[PDB]
């Protein structure tokens, strides 16, 4: 009553201000932890009112920061779990055709989900080996921990290069290049205005993305649109290493602030002076790669085309939970 309430408040806070926790996987983990707290130690009797509670909570949990859509699709997945569990123990209306056994069963489903979600990096890693060959080239914009495990375990058997460009709005790919070269993968850094030059010398593009929309048109750290577009221009294949929970059943133009216009004090620093009263410096940190540039999503169940993602949608999130 009070503990869960202060937890929800602290969580909507540290989701509304900045990045906390850091790794998106850890955000999924804490969202499932909070949702398990709610599904266990709250007040609800019928399954329908429980769905409505998860609704009028997730509305806020996703409207706090409407760009971090890991928590959003985690809510939607627990909703689909409620629906599937209802379908099972019903043997579409929502009557309390069953009781507290439902609670333990939902907890079991969420525990199985949390376990198969903890073992995500290990799966994508142990299946990375089947895409890389000796003496080739791999660009990785930004710094994604999953692409990181991918490219730092697929170097226990082969040797290549990883021309890791850097996200320019605020240089974060540098930590990526360092965390590779400490494992010794002949890396290379450059400034992301240097892509349509070096792209003629690239054998593959393992970008890391924040989300995957329905069409497969992902939503990834900025600049990745122009990288992906140069890749399409050379028809060098992209291997968008994006795990399962980073999926989301929304759609391209179904939202404003698709991007995330962040404090433009890091593009044109404040120390500038007079001219900062007339210019309107922009800063979108999240771009929108169109679908047909992508080629091969390495989910944690094996590769999948781009024009196959809607099946994963219909298998993960219910077709009526697209507005929540």
């Amino acid at each position: 009553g009070s503990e869960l309430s202060e937890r929800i408040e602290s969580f909507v806070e540290t989701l509304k201000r900045g990045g906390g926790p850091r790794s998106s996987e850890e955000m999924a983990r804490e969202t499932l932890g909070l949702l398990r707290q709610i599904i266990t130690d709250h007040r609800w009797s019928n399954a329908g009112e429980l769905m409505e509670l998860i609704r009028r909570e997730g509305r806020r949990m996703t409207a706090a920061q409407p760009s971090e859509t890991t928590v959003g699709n985690m809510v939607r997945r627990v909703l689909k779990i409620i629906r599937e569990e209802y379908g099972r123990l019903h043997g579409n209306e929502d009557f309390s055709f069953h009781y507290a056994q439902l609670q333990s069963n939902i907890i079991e489903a969420i525990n199985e989900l949390l376990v198969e979600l903890e073992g995500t990096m290990e799966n994508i890693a142990a299946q990375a080996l089947e895409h890389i060959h000796s003496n080739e080239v791999i660009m990785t914009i930004g710094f994604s921990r999953t692409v990181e495990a991918f490219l730092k375990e697929a170097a226990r058997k082969r040797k290549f290069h990883v021309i890791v460009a850097e996200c320019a709005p605020f240089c974060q790919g540098h930590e990526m290049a360092v965390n590779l070269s400490k494992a010794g993968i002949e890396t290379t850094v450059m400034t992301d205005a240097a892509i349509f030059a070096v792209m003629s010398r690239v054998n593959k593009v393992i970008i890391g993305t924040k989300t995957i929309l329905a069409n497969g048109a992902l939503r990834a750290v900025t600049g990745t649109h122009t990288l992906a577009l140069a890749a399409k221009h050379h028809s060098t294949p992209l291997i968008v290493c994006a795990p399962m929970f980073k999926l989301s059943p929304q759609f391209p133009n179904e939202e404003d602030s698709f991007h995330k216009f962040v404090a433009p004090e890091e593009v044109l620093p404040f120390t500038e002076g007079d001219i900062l009263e007339k210019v309107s410096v922009h800063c979108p940190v999240f771009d929108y790669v169109p679908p047909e540039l992508i080629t091969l999503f390495i989910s944690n169940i094996g590769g999948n085309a781009p024009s196959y993602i809607y099946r994963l949608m219909s298998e993960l999130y219910h077709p009526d939970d697209h507005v929540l």
Binding site: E9, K16, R17, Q65, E265, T271, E277
Partner: protein, 429 residues
């Protein structure tokens, strides 16, 4: 560690915003249609302050009633604002004597004035300050905060420059002085006496007024009944440092941001700043305060637009505009850089360059406003043309065909406004 208090003197102790400060205090003016005191409370909650002893002298009733329906008064907040107010005290020094006599605070508060617009995560500066303090037995009492800026940035008004001669080894403070009309600069050569290791005098600081303190600071304020500002406090301290040293310390920040609205020009600049995302996370779309009235939804060109604006035909919004709820922009309009609050009204062919509106304002056709605040309910009639910085507030009215000169503040109170309210600039009574 113990919690981290923060005194909050929510009353600007000089009548800088006349004739407006008669209607409502300066700690309730809306920048982004949100009250300043909420900006500061949100800053303090973000940094992690456990309690903010909001103090008040002018219109205790108004601030108190506003703040009870805040998002902090409700018991869920991790930052339990406790409002203390009296009609006695009149200057910041009296506030410090108050927090010494009543003996409320315990350690390391944040003597921030009422109305800073900031998002400074000072936790690291606090930690470095506590290091400096427990490292040498309570001889570092005040760790001001300061923002980088080139000396010509428009958020810099003609009374806030602080040419602050600082040692550069441990970022110590040595001399502090405002520049309200100086083409020279004075520096007592006593700075150079001991530490030949460099005194990086700086003119690129922008006074943010977030000076940390300690219980010894309020103690020192009791020691002299003639301390009546943070400014002259640090001046007197750094003058008679030789006995009872208590050396100040500084900590500049580069990638954060923070200002303090003093007069209306700095207010204009800082409104434009909070409009153009310059202080994200604090920005309208995020709706840091929990209300549906101004729950805006971001858009391209930083042209915000709240719910139910129902703008008309050919009304081409240009850039940096906000639009609170309920408004209705007429046909063939043109708005840019404005901040149209809630409940407004607009006519035809009525440009609004750099203006600012608050609520209830109802501009009619033909008007051509510019850079000019218009306070609550400040109706306007047709075929009028305002001019820069032409404030007009608090149910004032302007009549047909009667423009105004350049700087012409008009309102309803007789002797504080430079004109009076009537069917124009003429016929005052």
């Amino acid at each position: 560690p113990p919690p981290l208090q923060a005194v909050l003197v929510a009353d600007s102790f000089d009548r800088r915003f006349f004739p407006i400060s008669k209607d409502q205090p300066r700690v309730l003016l809306p920048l982004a249609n949100v009250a300043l005191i909420d900006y500061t409370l949100e800053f303090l909650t973000a940094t992690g302050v456990q309690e903010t002893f909001v103090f008040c002298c002018w219109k205790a009733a108004q601030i108190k009633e506003h703040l009870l329906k805040s998002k902090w008064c409700r018991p869920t907040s991790l930052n339990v604002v406790r409002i203390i107010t009296s009609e006695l005290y009149r200057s910041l020094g009296d506030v410090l004597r108050d927090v010494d006599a009543k003996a409320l605070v315990r350690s390391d508060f944040l003597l921030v004035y009422g109305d800073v617009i900031s998002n400074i995560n000072i936790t690291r500066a606090l930690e470095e300050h506590r290091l400096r303090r427990k490292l040498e037995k309570n001889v570092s009492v005040m760790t001001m905060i300061f923002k980088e800026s080139s000396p010509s940035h428009p958020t810099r008004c003609h009374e806030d420059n602080v040419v602050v001669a600082v040692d550069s080894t441990t970022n110590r403070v040595l001399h502090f002085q405002k520049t309200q009309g100086l083409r020279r600069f004075a520096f007592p050569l006593s700075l150079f006496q001991g530490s030949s290791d460099g005194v990086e005098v700086r003119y690129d600081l922008l006074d943010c007024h977030i000076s940390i303190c300690s219980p010894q600071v309020a103690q020192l304020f009791t020691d002299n009944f003639d301390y009546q500002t943070r400014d002259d406090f640090v001046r007197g301290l750094l003058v008679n440092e030789e006995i009872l040293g208590n050396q100040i310390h500084m900590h500049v920040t580069a990638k954060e941001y923070g200002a303090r609205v003093s007069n209306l020009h700095m207010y204009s600049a800082v409104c434009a700043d909070v409009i153009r995302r310059w202080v994200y996370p604090l920005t309208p779309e995020a709706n840091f305060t929990d209300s549906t009235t101004q729950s805006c939804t971001h858009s391209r060109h930083n042209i915000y637009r709240g719910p139910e604006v129902s703008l008309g035909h050919g009304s081409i919004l240009e850039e940096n505009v906000l639009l609170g709820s309920g408004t209705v922009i007429g046909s063939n309009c043109f708005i840019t850089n404005s901040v149209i609050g809630p409940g407004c009204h607009i006519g035809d062919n009525v440009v609004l360059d750099q203006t600012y509106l608050w609520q209830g304002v109802r501009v009619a056709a033909g008007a051509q406003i510019h850079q000019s605040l218009l306070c609550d309910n400040a109706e306007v009639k047709e075929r009028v043309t305002l001019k820069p910085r032409s404030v007009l507030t608090s149910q004032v009215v302007v009549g047909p065909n009667i423009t105004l000169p350049e700087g012409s503040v008009i309102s309803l109170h007789p002797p504080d406004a430079e004109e009076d309210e009537d069917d124009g600039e003429f016929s005052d009574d």
